[PDB]
Amino acid sequence: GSSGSSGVPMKDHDAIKLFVGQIPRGLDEQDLKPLFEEFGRIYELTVLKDRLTGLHKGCAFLTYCARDSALKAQSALHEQKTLPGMNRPIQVKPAASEGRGESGPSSG
């Protein structure tokens, strides 16, 4: 066991669960960890798959043990990287308080 391998993982009290909606078909959490591991250590990675059919819907939930880790990987991947087979870049947002979300553009 390396980098831990003791028991259950520990996250931050103010952590953030990021959500990706640019996951093609044929890959898995094992192919996403590599990239997410470029910013820091992951806490949890689950892929969303249909039920009736069970076919990879095309999205997954990524969680970071630290707050910053998310901020970086988020603003570092969000419309920055382009997975293989995806004409468009990868979309990653802080899966939280979706109901009400305030945001606005800014020059510069």
The experimental method, as deposited, was NMR
List the domain boundaries for the chain: 1-108
> Measuring CA to CA, which residue among 87, 33, 88 is closest to residue 60?
33
Q: Write the CA distances from 98 to 29, 69, 72, 94, 103, integer angstroms.
A: 24, 20, 20, 9, 12
CATH superfamily, domain at 1-108: RRM (RNA recognition motif) domain (3.30.70.330)
Side chain identity at residue 47, one-letter code: V
Side chain identity at residue 15, one-letter code: A
